[PDB]
Write a protein that binds this ligand. Structure first.
Ligand SMILES: Nc1ncnc2c1ncn2[C@@H]1O[C@H](COP(=O)(O)OP(=O)(O)OP(O)(O)=S)[C@@H](O)[C@H]1O
Ligand SMILES: Nc1ncnc2c1ncn2[C@@H]1O[C@H](COP(=O)(O)OP(=O)(O)OP(O)(O)=S)[C@@H](O)[C@H]1O
Ligand SMILES: Nc1ncnc2c1ncn2[C@@H]1O[C@H](COP(=O)(O)OP(=O)(O)OP(O)(O)=S)[C@@H](O)[C@H]1O
Ligand SMILES: Nc1ncnc2c1ncn2[C@@H]1O[C@H](COP(=O)(O)OP(=O)(O)O)[C@@H](O)[C@H]1O
Ligand SMILES: [Mg+2]
Ligand SMILES: [Mg+2]
Ligand SMILES: [Mg+2]
Lengths: 320, 340, 331, 258, 330, 260
DNA sequence: GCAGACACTACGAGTACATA
DNA sequence: TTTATGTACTCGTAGTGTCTGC
């Protein structure tokens, strides 16, 4: 069995708060907390892959360089995050006597706290209210709606935002300077367009393209990763001249092996997030796509159901 | 019992003179009990399907089939939800009804037929109101009735057998029970009034009962009893026709919809509909009666009547595919007032 | 015997299965070999899926090994995800039963056991997804045989793995020999066209045809006149609407006058006729007639189809029939 | 005559072997040949392997004409073994192309013969032979002492680090609530040779193991009074429990270190 | 299994045991081979329609990476097996944590049909993927990508298994006939391609059933008649005749022709309707409204057919829908 | 819930020899029902801006960070009177920039909006507003925002829309469309969404249709009857009439068992 | 040695959520 | 009093096995 090279996702994982590129105000605030020391309870939320847990880990490393292995607790959904284990472990950690530097506090990191049970969060509320001058919590969830209201009340909400293409380009050029590779600007633009703000997706696509071909060119990138289905579905829905939408479907979704359920769900999401057309036409289109979704889920999954959904959408578009 | 509908009931096929061809067919079935297929009697409600079933059972098994014993049984469902349904058992046969909660009747019908299937030679099973079974329960009943045939036989009673699934209708011998004619209702009511003591002078009142019942023997007998006790056992040729309060309020709602078309009238109709649904009347019959009362108004034009019946069909389909039973009626009334 | 003619005349071997020549031939040629694949029997009710699978079971093993090498699961027992995950997997993992010496002499017992799953369309999606890899993995020792009336309820991976054997509907051309054999064996006298009418009334439902024939024979025995069955008797027993009432319905429809149609529909619903047969006869009278142009038939086909689709989902027959007759009247 | 005829003296024996790896393994198979009833199975998590061999010496009378494979569910087998007394004598009976075995519980003290049948199973796991023969450290310590050490160190943490030095055996179990360090040195007890501990150190060994699987290992300490651990880097640990005729050797995969 | 091969269905008697034998998928197979030869193997995600060769590809890949003992060197967790978050927290955790027991190489975890997992299980699994990715690789097979958490898609590299083209199915058919000593006709081969619909399992099933149909497996060939009789599929000539009668002739003759075609070989209405839809796609239609009417009415027709009902009324509805849609000046 | 300690606390309230004080968030839980009147009903409200203003002036004096007297109203109204998050907000802002004015107040507000899950009355009140369905309102309050608003209380929102989808004076009427026509259009989609809800809560349990149920039950029916209201939001009356209907059913099967 | 006293895994029943 | 399977969590429960000491 051959050995495996470390993936570029964590082979170039940042270790300093200056390495991560993104929301400049957020990173400056994190650096200020790093220099000062008095870290408040924070709830970091945002889209996947935009550098949430890496910032928390870098901040904890900078704050507890010498006592990271002793005064930092890391829990996630992979651990038994239930009321008994949360109670016992968090209360044992929050009362443990560890002589940190005067500005440094214990940090309890809870990755992906969105999937955490309500009673465990209720216990965490009381634990945070008791032990706050010795330990400081730190959540990192994709959506902050799952976390109960009192936990957000006693924390400091800090939301991330999707990275602009400039920051993804800067990081990609930094990694390309770190490891030698031949690239074309068209290939990098294609990778950035495919990533859609997801830095981890960009790194995975770049690594896959380099391993598959060795040259980061537009054709190689489009061979490794296909065009995203939301874009082709949006092109299908927005286009008039029903025959054109029918052939777009039959060419780019049916013969490319996309399941009918996936096409219908993607159409629902696209027409929900669509902004070019007015509200009433979006509502009708959602109604028709939902009727087709009901038909598909009942079991009648064929090309003709999708064609009929497109036909009803186009009859709506031409205003009968 | 004080009611005249129940204790004036035939007990054998000989006493049944309502339909000669149906009685002859039942006698043909009862001649050889050894080879008896599964029955499914369908037709309009209240014509006496259960009377035919019990008469056939007595003609096959013998007497004592009317010695019904009320036996109670216990059932286990999901979580702690416990349902208690009493089975109306009897010698030589058994009766079961979907009186339990609609969503969970599959387990009950399943373990009753499995238990009775273990122990002339066979034991008949009568399922009253079979059109109310959920489609999964009928699917379970299919293989249960197909596997065991030497031990169990099903006489399945239902009106408007459309909700019955196709395989059940395939393995069930279908028997049609037509509604009583006006002459038959008049003859039965004449027999009842002759056996009892009511000061009756004109046959016109009996025919008016027959017309007002719409081929419903049970409703006709209830009407006769009601206005017989009201009229001090002396029927008058100009006696007003008494109708159930549900009919009266449905007609009042119909007149309210016809005379005014306003949103305040719509919220009043919502209140009335909620009251009627709380009064335990199935939404299908409510929609049917409301539609047939709307179509009887002479003020409405033919195009409005066609639109009303089309929307009535659409919302009847929605009611058959719904679980709230009030949203569909409210939508139907809104569409009707928009049309009017 | 003491059984209805449906159970009494159920096929025993695969030779008695009338029509369905493709599936029966494939199974009979598979009997000599041991290459039985995962089967997916489907078709209209009464076509003979259960009879075929039981005959194949009797032919492969014999009445001794059926109880030991066959597992059947109907809707009579629960078929959720847990039972499929535990009982079906446990049965599949088990080694095949030990044949007796007599069975090895007489029957060609294959080195596998058949897991019949009647009404597989009633399973949930999760149960079928759990069944997929169990079907694909332990297939060397067991064979699955799904039976369902609707393929669409089955998810597409199971449709991919299971070999599909569509069971054709039996009509007056395919199943006339079976009804003739039943009539000759049970000594039932009938006219030349009685059996054709019986098979025409049913729609691929030979079981219903057998029940109708048995009921007609019982009526003839009760009469005791020794007279051959006529088409009118079977027509009346089957629930078939007489043609005079259909002609009256058409006359009312052609004349308009919505109130008259409503009154006649109320009387018709009093008569107790099933709406499905009425719609079927209206279709057979209107489409085959030559007194109507192309546009009338084009509209009335859609009207009848919509009424049939609405009647399939339960609903009140009175309102659906009235609406259908009103829309046809306005044509 | 049944082709497989294996007789057990002191039928509590086979129950002890079955209970040795009932908890860790759920599905086994028994390649019964003329040499003896061997077995080998891998857990669902593919971490711990259980090899087994029972020689002809442990059987009163053993006769196996052809190689037999008996894929089994260990839960049902252990339940069947629990359906008897240690006084009774157990017998495994299988015919040609077996569908199930026959287990007999006979005793001449009182005629109460009980015949149980357990359904077989098609595991279809061909596995492979052991291809590990060279080990750095070969140590043998009493089973009771090792089981006790594992038991009181599994409560502190989930990882038990076994370190081998020059005549020094160290168990480190650092965890959330504290730490642990059990240091045991070789000594030869002349009075009780069974309580002696031996060490044979070639190359230094530093391996960590999971707590739950090590508890599953020590659950077999009732089978034999002494266990011989044979550690080596880039090699699974070999915990061998000797029998009167064969052995019950386990293979445990050390956790990764990064 | 039992009694070796030759007692297995042709679906699994012909299973790819080598990455060279996997036909149809060229870019995917070549990229995977380059991945494993170069030494870098990212978290693979195989997505495609059933029968394309996803699990066959991953099993052949595991066999090539490890050897003949790949069965116990990998952890394949199916929907048939329990895959709750307890399984993710225990079995996947300690299989990724521990070292290999039989070799020195990495650990491969094959989450076959992973779309049928709880969202909590995927959430717990994403941290296992991200933590032990230094020396353990996850492969995810998913028929539907909408049932997967977007984070789980983010961790894994997207690979798409396209429907099988004509050449792959023709080559596999040729190999099947070579091994079975069976003869085929080119027209029958084309019919098999049309019945495939990008699913080789269907082709293998139809070939097995057609060989069973033949009275003599040797000295005989499978023509179109055998294929269409055993599959119960409409012939192109019958579909063309039915469509011509519907589009040109009047109601009585068209109805008689459709009824005769259905009753000649017991043709199902659903397959005839699908054939009509496929033929009507090639038609050039000047009016857009005709397309809308055809698609909507026909879709309602198969929905009602799937719900069941009367076949005569549905056939008349098909005829009426086609005629009324083509009536408005094509 | 049942056997979860609430009945035990009711017993404690019934019989205690020492003062008993309970602290919770809000009373509209069906779990919180057994404390209807057995316990005292003192309630706290959102503190006034003047007391918070004085407290935060003292805080600004103590922590030597600049705090304008006018940005504090916006800081309070963004946080919805939650004083603890207000103090945390000023702390984390003053960590790197201790001076706040009109320049940064909009950024601070958009970055530290409280985002409370809305009360079942509030979902209906916001959804029935005609401003959000206008051209300007659609841009500011997108369709995804309305879907999230439904999913805030997806259990009670479909009903709460329905009991008062006709008690609103319309403001989004199409030219030539009467109010009754809009009400009928809304009722048609309520009926359509009823089927989707039944299919979700059935044997199959197809729970991927919830976003469909959002549009079919709350978004579209409220998109035709939006505008200012005739009265205050009426609570779901379907629950009480459903209870009364269930009791009437139970009585009818009871008298049916007795009459045989 | 026997009977308890303990901690232990295991089973049963009930609440809660289910698309971003 | 509502939904109606499957999943996950949480609890108290009853057996089950092991160590102390009369
Ligand atoms: N601002 C950034 N600068 C540099 N690398 C980044 C940045 N954001 C993300 N990355 C890269 O993304 C990977 C880390 O992503 P994560 O922070 O683990 O994703 P995440 O924010 O935790 O989102 P989820 O919810 O866990 S999927 C590493 O490969 C980083 O190099
Ligand atoms: N091809 C056939 N040849 C002979 N008898 C048949 C045939 N098909 C059906 N039958 C008769 O129909 C009855 C058995 O029907 P089944 O085999 O149960 O049909 P089915 O496929 O099971 O339909 P279901 O399961 O109820 S939907 C017996 O009376 C058989 O004689
Ligand atoms: N590219 C291919 N080359 C050769 N045979 C193939 C190919 N793709 C599929 N097959 C055949 O199809 C059979 C089943 O396909 P599998 O690969 O096992 O399942 P799958 O294609 O992954 O579909 P699902 O989603 O798992 S049901 C295999 O045993 C092969 O005989
Ligand atoms: N031949 C008959 N002569 C007199 N009354 C009859 C006859 N057949 C039926 N009935 C009446 O029908 C009533 C019973 O109807 P029932 O069986 O409840 O109808 P359903 O079966 O539709 O509920 C009895 O009160 C009885 O008087
Ligand atoms: Mg993270
Ligand atoms: Mg069947
Ligand atoms: Mg697969």
């Amino acid at each position: 069995t051959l050995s495996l090279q470390l993936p570029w996702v964590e082979k170039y994982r940042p270790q300093v708060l200056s390495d991560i590129v993104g929301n400049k105000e957020t990173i400056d605030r994190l650096q200020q907390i790093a220099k000062d020391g008095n870290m408040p309870h924070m709830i970091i939320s945002g889209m996947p892959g935009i550098g949430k847990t890496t910032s928390v880990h870098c901040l904890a490393h900078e704050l507890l360089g010498r006592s990271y292995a002793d005064g930092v607790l890391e829990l996630n959904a992979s651990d038994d995050r239930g009321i008994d284990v949360v109670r016992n472990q968090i209360k044992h950690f929050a009362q443990k006597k560890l002589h940190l530097p005067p500005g440094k506090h214990k940090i309890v990191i809870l990755d992906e706290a969105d999937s955490m049970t309500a009673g465990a969060q209720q216990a965490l509320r009381r634990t945070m209210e008791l032990y706050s001058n010795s330990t400081r919590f730190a959540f990192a969830c994709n959506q902050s709606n799952k976390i109960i209201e009192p936990l957000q009340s006693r924390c400091a909400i800090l939301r991330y935002s999707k990275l602009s293409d400039e920051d993804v380009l800067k990081r990609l050029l930094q990694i390309i300077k770190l490891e030698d590779v031949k690239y074309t600007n068209d290939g990098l633009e294609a990778i950035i367009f495919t990533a859609e703000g997801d830095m981890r997706q960009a790194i995975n696509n770049l690594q896959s393209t380099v391993a598959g071909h060795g040259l980061v060119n537009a054709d190689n990138v489009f061979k490794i990763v296909d065009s995203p289905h939301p874009l082709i579905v949006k092109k299908m829905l927005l286009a008039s001249n029903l025959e054109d939408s029918i052939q777009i479907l039959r060419t780019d979704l049916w013969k490319k092996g996309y399941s009918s359920i996936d096409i219908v769900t993607t159409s629902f999401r696209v027409t929900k997030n669509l902004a070019q057309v007015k509200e009433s036409v979006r509502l009708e289109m959602i109604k028709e796509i939902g009727l087709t979704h009901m038909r598909i889920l009942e079991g009648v999954g064929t090309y003709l159901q999708l064609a009929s959904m497109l036909a009803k959408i186009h009859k709506l578009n031409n205003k009968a | 019992m004080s009611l005249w509908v129940d204790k004036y009931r035939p007990k054998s096929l000989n006493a049944l003179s309502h339909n000669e061809e149906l009685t002859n067919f039942l006698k043909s079935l009862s001649d050889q009990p050894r080879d008896l297929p599964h029955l499914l009697l369908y037709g309009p409600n209240g014509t006496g399907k259960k009377t035919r079933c019990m008469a056939l059972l007595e003609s096959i098994f013998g007497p004592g089939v009317y010695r019904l014993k009320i036996d109670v049984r216990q059932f286990v469902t999901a979580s702690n939800r416990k349902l208690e349904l009493n089975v109306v058992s009897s010698p030589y046969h058994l009766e079961i009804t979907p009186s339990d909660m609609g969503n969970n009747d599959r387990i009950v019908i399943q373990e009753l037929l499995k238990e009775v299937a273990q122990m002339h030679r066979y034991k008949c099973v009568i399922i009253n109101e079979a059109n109310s079974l959920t489609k999964d329960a009928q699917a379970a009943l299919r293989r249960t009735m197909e596997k065991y045939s030497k031990n169990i036989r099903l006489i399945m009673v239902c009106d408007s057998m459309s909700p019955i699934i196709a395989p059940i209708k395939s393995r069930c011998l279908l028997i049609r029970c037509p509604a009583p004619s006006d002459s038959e209702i008049s003859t039965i009511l004449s027999d009842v009034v002759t056996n009892e003591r009511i000061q009756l002078e004109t046959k016109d009142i009996l025919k008016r009962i027959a017309q007002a019942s719409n081929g419903n023997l049970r409703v006709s007998l209830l009407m006769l009893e009601s206005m017989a006790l009201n009229n001090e056992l002396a029927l008058k040729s100009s006696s007003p026709i008494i109708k159930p309060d549900w009919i009266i309020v449905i007609h009042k709602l119909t007149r309210k919809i016809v005379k005014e078309r306003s949103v305040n009238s719509l919220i009043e109709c919502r209140a009335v509909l909620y009251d009627l649904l709380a009064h335990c009347i199935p939404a299908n019959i409510i929609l049917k009666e409301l539609t047939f009362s709307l179509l009887d108004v002479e003020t409405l034009n033919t195009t409005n009547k066609s639109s009303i019946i089309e929307y009535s069909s659409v919302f009847d389909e929605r009611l058959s595919l719904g679980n709230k039973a009030i949203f569909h009626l409210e939508g139907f009334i809104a569409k009707v007032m928009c049309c009017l | 015997a003491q059984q209805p003619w449906v159970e009494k005349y159920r096929p025993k071997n695969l030779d008695e299965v009338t029509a369905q020549d493709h599936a029966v031939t494939v199974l009979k040629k598979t009997l000599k070999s041991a290459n039985l694949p995962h089967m997916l029997f489907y078709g209209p009710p009464g076509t003979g899926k259960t009879s075929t699978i039981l005959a194949l079971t009797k032919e492969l093993y014999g009445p001794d090994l059926m109880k030991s090498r066959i597992l059947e699961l109907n809707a009579s027992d629960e078929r959720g995800i847990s039972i499929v995950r535990e009982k079906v997997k446990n049965f599949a993992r088990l080694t095949v039963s030990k044949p007796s010496k007599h069975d090895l002499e007489n029957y060609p017992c294959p080195p596998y056991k058949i897991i019949i799953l009647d009404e597989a369309d009633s399973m949930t999606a999760d149960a079928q997804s759990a069944l997929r890899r169990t079907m694909e993995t332990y297939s060397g020792v067991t064979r699955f045989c799904l039976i369902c009336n609707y393929v669409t309820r089955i998810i597409d991976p199971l449709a991919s793995r299971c070999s599909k054997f569509r069971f054709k509907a039996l009509d007056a051309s395919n199943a006339i020999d079976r009804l003739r054999f039943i009539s000759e064996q049970e000594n039932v006298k009938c006219d030349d066209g009685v059996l054709e009418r019986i098979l025409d009334i049913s729609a691929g439902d030979l079981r219903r045809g057998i029940t109708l024939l048995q009921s007609a024979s019982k009526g003839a025995q009760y009469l005791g006149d020794g007279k051959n069955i006529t088409s009118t008797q079977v027509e009346e027993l089957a629930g078939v609407v007489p043609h005079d009432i259909l002609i009256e319905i058409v006359e009312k429809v052609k004349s308009g006058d919505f109130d008259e149609i409503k009154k006649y529909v109320n009387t018709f619903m009093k008569s107790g006729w099933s709406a499905a047969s009425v719609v079927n006869q209206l279709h057979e009278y209107y489409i085959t007639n030559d007194n109507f142009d192309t546009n009338f038939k084009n509209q009335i086909s859609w009207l009848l189809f919509t009424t049939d689709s609405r009647l399939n989902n339960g609903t009140n027959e009175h309102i659906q029939l009235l609406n259908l007759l009103v829309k046809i009247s306005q044509l | 005559a049944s082709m497989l005829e294996a007789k057990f003296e002191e039928a509590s024996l086979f129950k002890r072997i079955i209970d040795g790896f009932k908890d860790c393994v759920q599905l086994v198979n028994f390649q019964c040949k003329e040499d003896g009833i061997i077995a080998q199975a891998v857990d669902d998590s593919r971490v711990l392997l259980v090899s087994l061999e029972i020689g002809v010496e442990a059987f009163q009378e053993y006769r196996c004409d052809h190689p037999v494979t008996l894929g089994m569910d260990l839960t049902s087998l252990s339940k069947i073994l629990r359906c008897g007394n240690n006084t009774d004598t157990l017998t495994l009976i299988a015919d040609n192309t077996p569908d199930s075995i026959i287990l007999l519980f006979e005793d001449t003290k009182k005629d109460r013969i009980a015949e149980y049948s357990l359904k077989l199973m098609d595991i279809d796991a061909d596995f492979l032979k052991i291809e590990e023969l060279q080990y750095d450290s070969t140590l043998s310590l009493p089973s009771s002492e090792f089981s006790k050490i594992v038991r009181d160190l599994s409560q502190l943490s989930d990882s038990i680090n076994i370190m081998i030095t020059k005549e020094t055996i160290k168990f480190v179990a650092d965890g959330d609530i504290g730490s642990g360090s059990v240091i045991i040195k070789p000594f030869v007890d002349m009075e009780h040779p069974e309580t002696s501990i031996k060490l044979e150190m070639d190359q230094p060994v530093d391996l960590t193991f999971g707590a739950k699987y090590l508890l599953d290992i020590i659950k077999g300490s009732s089978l034999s009074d002494r266990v011989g651990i044979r550690l080596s880097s880039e090699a699974p640990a070999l915990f061998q429990f000797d029998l009167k005729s064969g052995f019950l050797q386990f293979f445990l995969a050390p956790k990764f270190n990064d | 299994e039992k009694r070796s091969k030759e007692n297995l269905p042709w679906v699994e008697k012909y299973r790819p045991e080598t990455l060279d034998e996997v036909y149809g998928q060229n870019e995917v197979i070549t990229t995977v081979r380059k991945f494993v030869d170069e030494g870098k193997l990212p978290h693979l995600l195989f997505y495609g329609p059933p029968g394309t060769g996803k699990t066959s590809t991953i099993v052949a890949l595991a066999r090539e990476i490890y050897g003949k003992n790949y069965s116990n060197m990998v952890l394949e967790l199916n929907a048939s097996d329990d895959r709750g978050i307890d399984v993710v927290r225990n079995q996947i955790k300690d299989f990724a944590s521990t070292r290999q027991i039989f070799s020195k190489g990495f650990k491969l975890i094959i989450l076959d049909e992973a779309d049928a997992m709880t969202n909590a299980a995927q959430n717990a699994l994403r941290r296992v993927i991200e933590r032990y990715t230094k020396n353990t690789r996850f492969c995810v097979l998913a028929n539907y990508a909408h049932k997967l958490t977007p984070a789980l898609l983010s961790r894994c590299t997207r690979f798409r298994f396209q429907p099988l083209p004509q050449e792959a199915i023709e080559r596999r058919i040729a190999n099947v006939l070579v091994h079975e000593k069976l003869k085929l006709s080119p027209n029958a081969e084309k019919a098999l391609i049309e019945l495939s619909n990008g699913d080789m399992r269907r082709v293998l099933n139809v070939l097995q059933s057609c060989k069973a149909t033949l009275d003599n497996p040797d000295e005989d060939e499978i023509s179109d008649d055998v294929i269409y009789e055993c599959c119960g599929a409409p012939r192109p000539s019958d579909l063309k005749a039915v469509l011509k009668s519907i589009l040109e002739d009047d109601w009585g003759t068209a109805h008689y022709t459709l009824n005769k075609v259905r009753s000649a070989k017991g043709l199902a209405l659903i397959d005839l309707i699908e054939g009509i839809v496929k033929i009507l796609e090639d038609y050039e239609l000047q009016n857009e409204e005709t397309r809308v009417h055809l698609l909507t009415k026909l879709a309602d027709i198969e929905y009602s057919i799937s719900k069941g009902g009367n076949d005569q009324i549905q056939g008349s509805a098909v005829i009426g829908a086609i005629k009324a849609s083509f009536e408005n000046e094509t | 819930g049942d056997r979860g300690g609430v009945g035990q606390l009711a017993q404690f309230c019934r019989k205690t020899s020492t003062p008993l004080i309970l602290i919770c968030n809000e009373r509209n839980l069906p779990k919180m029902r057994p404390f209807d009147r057995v316990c005292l009903d003192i309630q706290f409200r959102r503190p006034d801006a003047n007391s918070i203003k004085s407290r935060l002036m003292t805080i600004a004096i103590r922590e030597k960070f600049k705090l304008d007297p006018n940005v504090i109203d916006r800081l309070i109204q963004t946080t919805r009177g939650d004083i603890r998050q207000v103090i945390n907000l000023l702390s984390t802002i003053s960590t790197t920039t201790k001076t706040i004015n009109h320049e940064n107040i909009n950024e601070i507000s958009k970055a530290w909006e409280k985002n409370i899950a809305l009360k079942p009355f509030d979902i209906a009140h916001k959804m029935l507003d005609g401003q959000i369905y206008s051209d300007i309102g659609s841009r500011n309050f997108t369709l995804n925002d309305k879907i999230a608003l439904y999913f805030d209380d997806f259990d009670f929102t479909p009903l709460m829309i329905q009991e008062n989808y006709l008690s609103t004076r319309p403001s989004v009427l199409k030219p030539g469309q009467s109010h009754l026509e809009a009400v009928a259009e809304a009722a048609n989609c309520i009926s359509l969404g009823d089927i989707v809800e039944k299919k979700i809560r059935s044997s199959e349990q197809l729970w991927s249709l919830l976003p469909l149920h959002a549009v079919l039950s709350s978004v579209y029916p409220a998109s035709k009857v939006a505008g200012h209201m005739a009265g205050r939001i009426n609570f779901t009356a379907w629950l009480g009439q459903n209870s009364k209907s269930a009791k009437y059913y139970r009585l009818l099967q009871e008298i049916h068992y007795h009459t045989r």
